[PDB]
Curated annotation (Swiss-Prot), chains A, B, C:
Domain of life per record: Bacteria
Listed CDD domains: FTHFS
Family: Belongs to the formate--tetrahydrofolate ligase family.
Keyword Nucleotide-binding included in the entry's annotation: yes
EC number in record: 6.3.4.3
Name used for this protein in its record: Formate--tetrahydrofolate ligase
Pathway, per record: One-carbon metabolism; tetrahydrofolate interconversion
Pfam families for the chain: FTHFS
Biological process (GO), any one: tetrahydrofolate interconversion
Gene source species: Moorella thermoacetica (strain ATCC 39073 / JCM 9320)
């Protein structure tokens, strides 16, 4: 009865975004078309509107996901469309989907059913070339580092201490660990290295936290690539790369204006994952939106223990933002998995499993409450959620003493979210927010890690491999102790162990390796077995993907 | 009717070699036993006998071989035993068999049937530890080069120009091309390198050309391992390795006294291949023998185009030796292959194929004639050679105007070689020898290569990959232009192409790569597709090899 | 001014070992000579003497070492000469020194000063070629594995699960992690691997545990080299290598007779280190010696936490030995270090530091107690040791209630060990032992690791990496949980952290990898950061090593 997401999105009727742009106080000459239905907005907009009030910032987070994902994006789009249908001047900010997973298992990040962002197949693929620009600035610097070595290694880099990897925006497990520079003296210096997925690039991180291009250029210059034989850092600015890198990012800095199925305006800009990067769209896109709309709905990657924590502690911190509300996306199907139902068994009514699994939602609620921001739960109704299940979960959130609304936006568009949209509005004028960060920058890297570990995931404490201890020692002694922490861990549990479902108790977080993002300005401790480059499944989506003589596309989702 | 070679050799009745040693003017205290049946002889022997006359030097060479090999060793042992049975004070000098091929396809190098050197399984395996000492001196230096790099690379070596490889005395194709030094800064410097088979080591080459240990130590020091960033050679003596290397060779320098099935004394010492190294036993062993015997029978590796040429042009040249006679080993089965008979078809009478194939023998004859040394052909009779075939070949050598004798030594021991033994003796007192080298040291590396290429193999000229041209340029400009040439090429043809049987005409030798043995004092141009490390077959001999509770050994050959 | 080890040892006055052997009732035809002064003794000696009575077994162990070593070997030899000088029929059993450390930092393992085993230079270099025999059996198995991958990978081995490594008897850090099999389809199958030092070989383990050559062979056949794609184990037996592996071991299996400076007989057989391997000489040498002497002195590598532990729990367990007494070697310098004094200062008087550092020795004393064997402390006097220092320690070991004797065997030979020899004799007359193992084979792998960590090292618990977890579970599931355990762990601490000196408290062991030795018959958990292939220092002893034209050796120590 509901057709495939690509059928829906190829049948969308879109407004010219030059219109939407003008319907928002954006001058004809601050728009740069990419066809009729996509544009980039000048940063002169936010500059000229510098001293004007902000609208209401709404974050959308979720519970602990299955591989299918639980509907933040779908919801965020839905919520925005619903608010438009109560006549509000609203905008949704989102992340650009990584190209890789569209050919893997997760698919794109445009939403679902009647809550989608269109032109969906442009959004999921090349979109407007932002990720490509990140990839080329990133890999440019890498080429220059390798050329430095070849051209007599003037700065005396120890090639075996180079942390700068390369990137490609595909799921390519064969490029995790590689030796390059082979073939003899004409062909470079042999060394061990590898690729991360482009969206996890520090270059993207910079895009996402910078305020303008000149700042991006300054940040690029601070990026640390390796170390000399006697341990002194070597930066991109030592290698004089920041100018070219910036040049390659000349258009990528400007955010992108698309729209929803119901013609509501949308910014898409930046796309770092939350398990392996900071999980928010650009600061640039959200500060702009907030000068142009009254309500700005925005998403953080994966669960509340990842994206929400990072949204609050890194992005909101660097931006000045004060979230007004937070929506917590929950599903019956996932809360059931969390209570012991097998993945292949999730479409079957199971009410006990929804009482048991609830622990998960409960901790996410408690954790958001910790930031001082009023929450609403949103029940994302799935095709096969039953009558009782949907009734029980509702009652558990009110019994839990927390705002809640059913959301039928997947199946019904914005009018699936009016209930939800009111409750959020109710929240805005009734419970003001009192946001504050989880931790002060002061603290040791190790104390900061322990605050997240215990306050958010609920472990007893934090294990450190000796490689981690050295790295941290090195980062504190060089004067980067102040930076905040972007944790890498599995999205599938509060723990660093992906098998531990629900609210797991009495465990340890094992920090394997610690990275320094001197340009983005944060520290990345890698926990558990998480990789910074994902792989493809037995049957990649790519095998079912196609296009025809008419431009009809199948298998994209 | 003839039992397996290992049955024969385990049933040998051996004299105590301390006896044989004394039966030769060797003092009780110049012998170092390794059991009753193997010893090492002091170099004080040759030193004290410095100014005493030499005996007659007899070389044993052959035609172009099949994979089975054509019987030089078997013959050399046979010839020696036959001469003993005409009451002569004779000794045979041979090469130590490489361990690797005993587990591969060729097997050992102790001889065959009733012409063998015993204790055969000691000779084929660890023998007296000479090859192990080469391997450890060689790999010691390699370890020190790698440690130099790790310890701050004081001499400024460009690790990508290191020519020093590692060695192991096995047929291990997986170690041809390897990257080592991986795992990060605590674990070395990544680089591309590999292993050659121990018997092809420059360290062995040195053993084989040195006169005493102090000379070996001096030669070790001249070995060139790599080059600095600005192209200056780096030597083992720069790295101060020659003392330890020499130390590891303290016993390996002394030659080994074993004996034949018929109790005739034997020296075994050094074992470089002839296709990929210089193909002679040590100078040390042959100069000693020649002070202790009246007739000294000695072997050069593979065909006359390889071993004989190198025996004359490198060893005899550096030693002073003047070969008195040369025996050319020929077989019907091989001359048949050379005339177009498939390998799986060689046990079947084929007289036309023996007239056609003869071209091969004819060129080897002409080539030896070129050195000014009187030749006898030896027909090594194989179990299935027919009556007519053996008759025809005889007549072709006399018709060819060249001395010839049937040799039944494989099946009958020394009394299979009396005919042969007389003809050689006939030769000694009737046709004096007038040996002289093929070329003067003066010449360019390139002229020297062309002399061998055209005079010996019969190609039109010599191709050079650009890598070869650079290397040669580098070796001439550093002042190693004078050194002689040890060619690497296939044993299976006069050409550098192994498929070209018989006397192939109008072809080119392609020199792929050129190596410098500054310690051994020669240049090694690698031609065709020949590797310096061989591989194992589909079913390695090793699968049929065993020993039992009694020490009965099967499958060694 | 005791002359350097090498001057003493070259100046030695030895007896032919043939005499030495007759005086133990070994027959002429059971001795196989390697010079006048080395032999290999037939396994027939032990066999024929099977039902005769065993002598007293005495273990020599030590406290936690400095890098230079605290004198176990120096003491084992001394003790043995000292016993002989008390008119006792006594034999020392030692391990063949690994070759690489002669060129490294540690040096050889022939003893020191006037307590050495001889001929030193041989004993430390190629000796009788046992290690080479190990090296070639191990590396032929590795060559056959790679060849199998090349010839169709018929057994379906997953090349990336291959645990079998290569070996070489050098300190080569560049061979730790390597990529082999490169160069294309003719040159093998690319894979990650590396080299361990030859003495840490499973082949070495088997030699050290086996009873005869047919036993060795059977052990070989059961060695697991890696796994199929679906997880089945693959053995040397499946590849039919055990036959050829045994051939190469035909002589390695027989133990070696040498002697001390004072001409006491000596067995030297098997070389395994105690940090990365099982750290005792062969059962063969020990059990044989127990038939020929009334007293058999024998050493375990590094400290009691490694060597003694393993001697007791795997050697004695498998051999049916019940050790009779145990010497703990201790020095002022090592104890001073343990009480905080920096290495560069261990020459200088500091009674206080020695008092605090006593903690180390105390724990080792306690630990030996848990085995049921009476102990004597041997205080091995160094030239730097002051009067009051040797007195304090003596008084401390007495107050601690331990039998103690000052030892001057380094400087005085066997007559400097009479007091020590006296105390040992005293212990054997009055105080029988009630030897018991530390754990049963019934226990699980983690049970047995936790006992050794807990009761011996004084660890609070053990941590496992995911990979360690998996390998343990793999081994239990496959039928090997029953095996005893040979921990790999730093020698420099009771902990797995090499800087935690004295008697570290409240620490945990971390197991990062678990090897299976299915043919030796034990399990090897690797802990902390310890590598199974060591490195060469800033300045190798190699650089200082030399031999002259007279055969006068310098630098070897
Ligand atoms: N209520 C729903 N019913 C069915 N499918 C849904 C629903 N909500 C989302 N989906 C689909 O499941 C996937 C997960 O939704 P998405 O918004 O991408 O979640 P998230 O952003 O949390 O990963 C997408 O394919 C989406 O189209
Ligand atoms: N006349 C013969 N009949 C049968 N087999 C022989 C004969 N001569 C040699 N062989 C065997 O064939 C192989 C080649 O002989 P060998 O002396 O090793 O030749 P080369 O030294 O030229 O390689 C050896 O296995 C040898 O025992
Ligand atoms: N009492 C001593 N005085 C001086 N040097 C010694 C003494 N005892 C041993 N040494 C030397 O110190 C090193 C370590 O002795 P060693 O017996 O090898 O101890 P271990 O066997 O425990 O390593 C050797 O070089 C040895 O000759
Ligand atoms: Mg999403
Ligand atoms: Mg031969
Ligand atoms: Mg020792």
């Amino acid at each position: 009865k509901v057709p495939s997401d690509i059928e829906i999105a190829q049948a969308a009727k879109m407004k010219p975004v030059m219109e939407l742009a003008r319907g928002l106080g954006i001058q004809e000459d601050e728009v740069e078309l990419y066809g009729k239905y996509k544009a980039k907005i000048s940063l002169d907009v936010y500059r000229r509107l510098k001293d004007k009030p902000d609208g209401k910032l709404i974050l959308v987070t979720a519970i602990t996901p299955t591989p299918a994902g639980e509907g933040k994006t779908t919801t965020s789009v839905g919520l925005t469309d619903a608010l438009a249908r109560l006549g509000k001047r609203v905008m949704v900010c989102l992340r650009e989907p990584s190209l890789g997973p569209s050919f893997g298992i997760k698919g794109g990040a445009a939403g679902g059913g009647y809550a989608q962002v269109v032109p969906m197949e442009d959004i999921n693929l090349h979109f407007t070339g932002d990720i490509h620009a990140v990839t080329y600035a990133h890999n440019l610097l890498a080429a220059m580092v390798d050329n430095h070595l070849q051209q007599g290694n003037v700065l005396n880099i120890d090639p075996r201490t180079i942390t700068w990897r390369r990137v490609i925006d595909l799921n390519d497990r064969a490029l995790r660990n590689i030796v390059i520079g082979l073939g003899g003296k004409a062909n470079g210096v042999p060394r061990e290295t590898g690729f991360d997925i482009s969206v996890a690039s520090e270059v993207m991180a910079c895009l996402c936290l910078a305020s303008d291009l000149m700042d991006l250029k300054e940040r690029f210059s601070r990026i640390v690539v390796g170390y000399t034989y006697d341990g002194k850092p070597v930066t991109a600015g030592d290698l004089e790369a920041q100018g070219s890198m910036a040049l390659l990012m000349k258009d990528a800095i400007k955010p992108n204006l698309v729209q929803t199925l119901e013609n509501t305006p949308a910014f898409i800009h930046g796309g770092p994952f939350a398990n392996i990067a900071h999980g928010c769209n650009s600061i640039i896109a959200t500060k702009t939106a907030l000068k142009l709309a009254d309500y700005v709905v925005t998403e953080a990657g994966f669960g509340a223990d990842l994206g929400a924590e990072k949204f609050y502690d890194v992005k909101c911190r660097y931006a000045g933002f004060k979230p007004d509300a937070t929506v917590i996306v929950a599903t019956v199907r996932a809360l059931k998995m969390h209570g012991g139902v097998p993945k292949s068994d999730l479409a079957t009514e199971n009410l006990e499993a929804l009482r048991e699994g609830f622990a998960n939602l409960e901790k996410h609620i408690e954790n958001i409450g910790k930031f001082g921001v009023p929450a609403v739960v949103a029940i994302n109704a799935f095709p096969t959620d039953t009558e009782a299940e949907l009734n029980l979960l509702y009652e558990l959130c009110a019994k839990a003493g927390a705002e809640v609304a059913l959301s039928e936006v997947w199946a019904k568009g914005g009018e699936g979210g009016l209930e939800l949209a009111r409750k959020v509005l109710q929240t805005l004028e009734s419970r003001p927010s009192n946001f504050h960060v989880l931790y002060n920058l002061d603290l040791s890297i190790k104390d900061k890690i322990a605050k997240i570990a215990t306050e958010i995931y609920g472990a007893d404490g934090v294990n450190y491999t000796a490689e981690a201890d050295k790295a941290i020692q090195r980062y504190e002694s060089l004067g980067y102790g102040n930076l905040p922490v972007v944790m890498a861990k599995t999205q599938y549990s509060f723990s660093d162990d992906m098998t531990k479902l629900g609210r797991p108790r009495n465990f340890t977080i094992t920090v394997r390796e610690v990275r320094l993002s001197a340009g983005a300005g944060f520290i990345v401790p890698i926990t558990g077995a998480i990789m910074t480059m994902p792989g493809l499944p037995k049957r990649p989506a790519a095998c079912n993907i196609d296009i025809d003589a008419d431009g009809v596309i199948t298998g994209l989702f």
